[PDB]
Amino acid sequence: GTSLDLLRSLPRVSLANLKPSPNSRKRERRPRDRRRGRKHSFRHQYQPLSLRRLQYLIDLGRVDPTQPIDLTQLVNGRGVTIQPLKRDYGVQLVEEGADTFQAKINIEVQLASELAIAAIEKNGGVVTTAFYDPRSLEILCKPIPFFLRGQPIPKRMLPPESLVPYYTDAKNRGYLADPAKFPEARLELAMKFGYVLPDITKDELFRMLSARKDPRQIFFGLAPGWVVNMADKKILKPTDENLLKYYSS
Amino acid sequence: DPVLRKCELRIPVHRRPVQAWVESLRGFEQERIGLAELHPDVFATAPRLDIVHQVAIWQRNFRRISYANTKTRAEVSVAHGPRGPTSYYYMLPMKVRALGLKVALTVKLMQDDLHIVDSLELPTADPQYLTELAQYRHWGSSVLLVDLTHEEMPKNVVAATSGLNSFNLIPAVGLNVYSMLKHQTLVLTLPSVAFLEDKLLWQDSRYTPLYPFR
Amino acid sequence: NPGFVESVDEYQFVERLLPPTKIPEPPKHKHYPTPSGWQPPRDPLPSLPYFVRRSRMHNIPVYKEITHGNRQMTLIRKVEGDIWALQKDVEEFLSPLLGKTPITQVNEVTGTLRIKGYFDEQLKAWLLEKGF
């Protein structure tokens, strides 16, 4: 960098020496002289995520592979942009990267593609779908603010009757799906591609991957109706019997 | 016993570290007592003076408020007169402002106008000694003294600087481009440089804030 | 009678939810290139007069750009060292493929190079050959 050698020789700069960059400011016309003289809402706005991006996120180590994929973690990793003002209601998956994304991990997405589900399951990953209320999901993305408000964790909502069939569908692998069909369903997906189905139970971390929260439960770690001692870095659980009845209600 | 400092953050391998002479104010001849390393990405940035020019204009004009007003003919119980209080406040991107500050540090260092010191502590509080020391070390007519935090700044230095118009004592958080240009030479304590480096270095990998920093 | 019970054991979940503030450096991989296709800068780095640093996201600083709605362009940003040497090599590399000396604009102040047309793939591959 010979430019630095120029700087050392040159004299000390002063305030007056400052000069605007070339073409930074355009000229203007003034009237002093003759120059200027004379003269859809119902449909959920699902937000997609590319598997190639998922491979990019996984390959770059942006999201910990050991931890199961969590939408909140993706928000913490700035993977996708969700705006409550946009009234985003859903999150979905993408079939892109089907041939360049060879990895297995547990994940939960509001919406999943049938083709993508088998491919990740073929690698050995676990995919499920859960329903988050758009208002509740906004709280999920930003848990700290409601702690500042002092609000307690509410019970997770359930889908409207329009979307119940999708979540209840076994092939969709929703939390409302019948677990009894899953062993049969997984074989059918394996048969469709024809790949040898790897049993999840064989995995050493099977329990960690298969862990799922209650439908009422917003958070894997935290049960609904809980409170957090943010000041003391602790978790507070209600001890009132009526509160338990309220949660049951 | 030389005082040897190394950059806490990882310097790029392709960039060699920057170095400068550590000084002390305890004695007149205590010019050199140690050697310190400075991050090239902070103290060896490109000389982009237009950013510094842009920052200076923002600094002067973001506080500008004009209160001039006049009554037009309809408001009489001026064809083009001032119309009420007007403000010129605007915000430059904070990355550019951080970038501009980085450029300023290089200019002072490359121009031999920046003097790195271990601490500001002085044997005496006399303002004369500070002026006397500056003359011996060929410092500029205007010298800026910066400390890590306002609360802990030594009393002796405060008294010397308080009585000197051209020698101004400011905390680390109070540093700005305008003062550096206004003052011929800059005196920085070693802790201040590390504090400045952390914030300036932290500017990298700037996750767009999803919530207020507070 | 307090209505709450406080426990320190279960706070691990809360710690997990905390958001990170710094981009993590790429993890070491047993085999390169990574299955996605990303490969870190080749080691040892080239000893050329000009060094090209990667972007904050550890990606090659090449961006496809179009201006005026008709002029396709590609820009290199993180140019370090002798820009003239890089221009000569870039001109030499692109002259055969384009069929003539490329039309380029050099902004030395910003340390950036402007080239008409879209040639990121060839340049990106060529940069990998250099070891950047």
Added chain:
Amino acid sequence: FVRLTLPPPKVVDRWNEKRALFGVYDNIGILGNFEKHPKELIKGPVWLRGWRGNELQRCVRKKKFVGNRMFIEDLHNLNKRISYLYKHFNRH
């Protein structure tokens, strides 16, 4: 016609405390961990601290901020001025 007398000599000190300390803490946000935004350091009319708008916007914001504390004469004058301003900008 022009003055026949000399103006008083004036000398201005550029290193006075006001000029010397001008601009200090302008980097409070970046250097203060962003606890205080630099906009918080703006001193001026309440309705335009950290905010900018055209003449019509400034007057309207002024009315809302201090409308309850404004004089009847001032409020009446402001309404009349606003009406003229509204017609000019929104129709011409």
Added chain:
Amino acid sequence: YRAPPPPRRRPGPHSPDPENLLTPRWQLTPRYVAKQFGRHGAISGVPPASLWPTPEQLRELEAEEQEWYPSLATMQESLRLQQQALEARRQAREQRI
């Protein structure tokens, strides 16, 4: 000269005086009190029990739950009825054509 001390925001909970007329109403609402608890937790001193709904609030909350939020069994019944209606419509279309 020596620069003045840097300006600092006052930390810790601040309790507005309820009697004062000037203090805005929204700063005296329970939501403000709940906000104080979140910022400083125990330092705020807000009773944790107050945070949960009161028994009168509890009764009100259940009313909306039944009124506005049906249970899974109710939807399952609605699906069965709608499926039966759809099946009848399909049969009517087939026989008609």
